[PDB]
Design a protein that fits this description.
part of a larger assembly, 2 chains, about 200 residues, mainly alpha, two-stranded parallel sheet, 6 helices
Chain lengths: ~200, ~525
Amino acid sequence: SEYGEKHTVARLIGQLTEAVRRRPYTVVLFDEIEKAHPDVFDVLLQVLDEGRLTDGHGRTVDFRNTILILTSNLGSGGSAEQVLAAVRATFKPEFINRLDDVLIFEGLNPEELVRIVDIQLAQLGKRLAQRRLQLQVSLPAKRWLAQRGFDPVYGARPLRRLVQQAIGDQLAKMLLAGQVHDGDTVPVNVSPDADSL
Amino acid sequence: QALQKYSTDLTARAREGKLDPVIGRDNEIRRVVQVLSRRTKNNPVLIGEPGVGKTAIVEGLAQRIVAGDVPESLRDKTIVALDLGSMEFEERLKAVLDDIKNSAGQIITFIDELHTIVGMIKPMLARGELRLVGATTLDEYRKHIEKDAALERRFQQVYVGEPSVEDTIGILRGLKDRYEVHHGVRITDSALVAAATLSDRYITARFLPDKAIDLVDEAASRLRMEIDKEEVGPDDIADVVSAWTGIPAGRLLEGETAKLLRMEDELGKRVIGQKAAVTAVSDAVRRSRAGVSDPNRPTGAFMFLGPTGVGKTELAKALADFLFDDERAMVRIDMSEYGEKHTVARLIGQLTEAVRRRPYTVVLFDEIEKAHPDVFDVLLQVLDEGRLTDGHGRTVDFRNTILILTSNLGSGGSAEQVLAAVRATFKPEFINRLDDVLIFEGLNPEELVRIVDIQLAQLGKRLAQRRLQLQVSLPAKRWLAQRGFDPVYGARPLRRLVQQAIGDQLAKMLLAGQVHDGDTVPVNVSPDADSL
């Protein structure tokens, strides 16, 4: 996301090189490849389908058994081919050919959005392992958190702010003023609008 | 964290009550909350003529957020007002945008006066991440932003009207205490009504509430100068609105039943005779100030015609004299130029954007005969509805102006020779929409002496620089009447007779000696001409 100009090739040709030659098995990310100027793709072109590149010292580091992974956000809501034909704009066809199966993620279903709340509350339970502070969440609140998970433009990310606005605020106030100590159980209960304690 | 260094924080100032209370306008607040909470392209723009309150809406939104009357997914999202003056440059801007996007939409940015933003934010706007609220004037918008049509597709124009007195009286009662402390003077609430009432019919160039605060401020300053009467009052407000705009000269607070009681006789000091066509013009003003008028019609739309040289243009500049205290604040268009079918476009506009500023001016239409019968079609919904349109899509209301139409058709018809000639050019769907068609008569030599008195008083007031009084005897004063003759050309050849008799020999005797300042120059009847 930082390689907007044509001369940040040199920081990886290197930061990319001398992190593989030590242990040649690590998986490699590439986050938000849209913002790179189309010169970084030229460096990436012999990474694919050959596996080797060079540097100043003259060694050909072999990418023959790592799992490359590319992320993007192009289109972001194309019907069936609106998102696919937008890829053909920026990427030259000598780069789309060298890839494997281009995968499309879908959105999220409110049927498959309940269980994310289970994962998030299990995560917050494992965060409070220092205090041994178990917390009790009832099923009406556990489905109350799903219905504010809404508006499928922003994904499941506003749910992870919803949990910290509902539970975490009043818990963080009731944690450092008394009446909550180690080993206690803090149940949550559905007040007619918000979540009580 | 980088937004700490290149921004203010309106929410932090709102949380200690340091904002003036915003009263009114539920519709615009609900509209801003509606637009700001959609999925993509969620960034409104406030647009209106200046002074009507556009910063006040955003401060009211901040008050309503800190109070908490908003819906669920707008609660506790601070409004961080950005800058572009205080803000290597592209690195700094990318740091600001990265710091905004790093949050979870918890920040509402606020670029005030965003017409400077033209001189890399373009992909961020359309995706829907950074919420942006702005405020432009209506006429810097079409110069700086509408030139750059890739940007302006990503906004939502929220129009804001303007005017109103009833809330401004409350605003002025609220802010009364602050100026009494800085200038150590008391301010009386009797004057505080007048400083907003009287600042609407006179000062029609700026917009509202800020214009009605400068009067209180400058009146307090003048009173401090005089205290170098212990409080301000309704007189010094009038003193300020006289000394600025020179409005005091014309009229000087002339308005009340006592004026409108004497209007058939006050107007006679500049128009002589024509008595049956002043008792009708003097009636569409009295019935419109009593409250009997039809609330969807112009207050008077009447057409007077007749022969030439009668006083039909002098009348329509004399009833624009005590309403406005001047004689140049009227919409004087001349339809003697619209011979062809495509000069409609210069007024549809030159007619339009001279009313929408101050919607009270009297409108002339000189010599409507020469217009091709297509301009009458434009004029047809002016009458009996009061509104027309233009390119921008606004319906300007002519509901309380006094339309005036002049003509010269026939010019000497007996009783129906002049009236049936109107029926030739005008279609009957246009004669019906008018008020009482007035006919002027000619002039009588009995009522022609006093015009010479008016003309010589005018020439006396012209020589006020030289303090040069001139003495006119009664035999010469009736000698000028008898050359006023041949009732085809009206009283216009008399105003050449005066400049051929007096003005020639006076202009010769003025620049060669023997006439100086303060002297008296009498005229005396030589057996043919006028002597000195």
